[PDB]
Symmetry: C3
Subunit: 338 residues, 3 copies
């Protein structure tokens, strides 16, 4: 019976091996609720070279692909004096929440929401839009509108193909160092509107412990990207956020050249940095819905939620998995009977 | 061994608790079949206030947002004389079934299908299109075309942004009191065509007994919405369908004002009314496919089925769940050995 | 206890019955990887009758819907002399792989890829594009561009609505006898771009043994379609590929008329031919993404991959299914205790 004992030991070993993690997408189900978890929208030009504004500014002022401090035009260009040159859309941010429709009144609106959160990014400056309040799905017309009624419409060198990144709530790193890579470019010559199908994949938490890694992940990855930028690029002269920590260094091409080089190197970091995962990651399937609205606004990005049926793929954990692999002891006993 | 007996009793209690329902999406699989379950299409203007036709009629005839019977223009406006004022698209309904293509003959058509089913709705009048026959998927060009070759093209105050609601088969309530809320607005200035990805979520039937609640649900919710409209709005003077039951009441602003108010109140009814669920609910993922067809038709809504791979998410029931939770008695016995 | 023994025998019988196949979509999970499995693109006009080029050629040269050899215009029209008349887009095929973007350099390109693979098809001639190398997902701008910078732009009778079939790798039959049926028609008057969401459904392998039926399936179905074309159409006079096997027969209307008739008959073959399934079938959800690019190219089909999150629905096999149905012997023993 030693043979059967060994085979049963192997069966229990497979049991224990499966015990770790074993996340199965138990419920990819289409749940419809009035409550809506709006994506965190970053409205930013994709990159300095791609963006027409930065390229034109550097070409008429400086030389080459930015960098070099633009010393020839002026020796007073600080690091922020060029990084904030990324100003594209801000100071008039509206997260207008068109909640739904109704026969008696209809045209439900909520102008006061989420303010212009100005966040610096590899593009230089973006308008992150926090989810101040979940929205109400009273109809297919559940579209959160991001509007920047800019002065004069900003028709002089208007950004033609600004980028729109729908990232999860409270993620500085995604909005600051991944908006030109993991974001959807959007023309704004017309009032473009995109449906955002929701895939709330709540992964499990085991052997990859997120421990509700929904807010920690953000700061961890942000500081880690900045730390790699500091480390691989051997330049500590750049201003370390607060001025009274190390001397200012903006004129030397260090700040632009080497920092951009390192940030590009650390663009692929999910492999470089690990142990962190948004256990409540929500994916925004961006689709093109035709919009019928003569929106004269400079940018009126209508993030539509025409699908209350969130395809929530909750990556449940099968606790019964361990129970069943232990029940395998029953078949153990049935061999023992043999 | 009383401790082990109690723990095993708890295990069996969890077994019984999981026994109820426990619906897991066993098969979200992409099945391709020639047979196609066409959506029930309602082509209706979203709401009286939103629709240009009703607003213009009331503005030039009556006052305010409809209501008040439009007495000033004429005292003979019955309840139906204004509700049927919703006539937008009807009397020339075609459910043309472009089944597919073929090299020898190609251009497969089926003009005779589903007729103009005129159904009254909160919008006032809509054309529900029953699924008379399942369609054949002989190619990606499997588009059911809803065509209303209206007299004179209806170019006078033509409805610019009519609403299209794809609801499940044989649902009066969805087509009569949820077309302006749970429907997709569609411009008709151009021959718009939408892909309808199919998600046939056949939920289970336990503790929420639908008992093939595919046709009952319809009448139940319809009569319940009408019943709430009658109850909360304390007005029995309105005509109760058949004339010879209670006296006609249309001139008093009751019919419009209070009935619209109550219908708006009961707009969110899935929470108010329960115990009913379409066990065979099919979700229509509406997506924008570019159409290349100079369709001069007033409305030529092409509900495309370019994806034979229906994403059927059959919410199977794990009968083996009970069997396994009973097998837990095997691990019970293995503790008993300890 | 004979009753319990019989019930347990029935339980084991259900066990064995479930043993066969029982494929559950264990993981429909959204995996993001730099590596991209590009679809095999066939850029072909849908059908001879539908295509404007073939219809115009036959109308001005011959009579009727092709067929009849076009003898009146010229008696030298061989079978290939008309089949290759399907030349629409070829000799300048580029599978340009726009891998991604980057802040330091950006605009990553790879012009050398996959060449003009000229494959004959029911349409007559198509450009199959093999996946020479998996692509890198360094940003949402991961679009494989199929470009045919044709001489003179091919503006004379330019194919307005060419068909684009995204079929799995190394499938001759799909690209040769199912491009006008299982393919998406695409206008080329503008630089159309389609998102290709990936659904890599790796079915199981049991009782439908594919045995990694990823390359065999191709040749099997191709030769079987050709074999049915030969069999049902009683005409062996047509050239059997290699000339020195049977005499050439192209002038008689046999080649066109009867062969097209039979090929149409065998259009629905998945029911006719069985035992073959792509165990690694990948489905391309074709969606419309608006493109901002003034591509003067005649055809610049941008198969975008803006969704690194491949919805891989791996149809795993539950080996633990057999183990649990055997554990049912534990509940067998618990009845025996009763």
């Amino acid at each position: 019976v030693v043979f059967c004992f060994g085979i049963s030991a192997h069966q229990i070993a497979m049991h224990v091996l499966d015990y770790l993690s074993e996340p199965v997408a138990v419920r990819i189900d289409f749940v419809a609720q009035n409550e809506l978890r709006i994506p965190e929208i970053t409205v930013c030009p994709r990159i300095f070279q791609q963006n027409t504004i930065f390229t034109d500014m550097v070409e008429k002022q400086g030389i080459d692909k930015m960098k070099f401090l633009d010393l020839i035009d002026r020796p007073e260009y600080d690091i922020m004096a060029v990084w904030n040159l990324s100003r594209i859309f801000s100071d008039n941010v509206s997260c207008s929440a068109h909640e739904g429709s109704s026969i008696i009144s209809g045209s439900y609106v909520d102008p006061n929401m989420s303010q212009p959160h100005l966040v610096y990014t590899t593009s230089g400056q973006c308008i992150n839009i926090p989810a101040s309040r979940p929205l109400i799905y009273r109809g297919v017309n559940t579209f959160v509108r991001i509007t920047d009624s800019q002065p004069r419409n900003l028709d002089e060198v208007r950004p033609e193909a600004i980028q729109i990144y729908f990232h999860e709530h409270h993620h500085a790193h995604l909005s600051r160092y991944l908006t030109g890579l993991r974001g959807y470019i959007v023309p704004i010559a017309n009032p473009f509107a995109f449906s955002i199908r929701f895939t709330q994949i709540n992964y499990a938490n085991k052997t990859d412990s997120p421990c509700v890694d929904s807010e920690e992940y953000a700061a961890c990855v942000e500081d880690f990207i900045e730390q790699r930028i500091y480390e691989k690029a051997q330049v500590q002269c750049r201003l370390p956020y607060m001025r009274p920590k190390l001397p200012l260094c903006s004129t030397p091409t260090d700040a632009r050249k080497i920092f951009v080089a390192t940030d590009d190197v650390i663009q692929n970091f999910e492999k470089e940095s690990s142990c962190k995962r948004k256990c409540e990651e929500t994916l925004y399937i961006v689709e093109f819905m035709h919009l019928f609205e003569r929106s004269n606004i400079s940018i009126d990005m209508s993030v539509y939620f025409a699908y209350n049926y969130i395809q929530v793929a909750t990556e449940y954990l099968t606790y019964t998995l361990r129970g069943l692999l232990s029940d395998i002891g029953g078949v153990l006993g049935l061999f023992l009977g043999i």
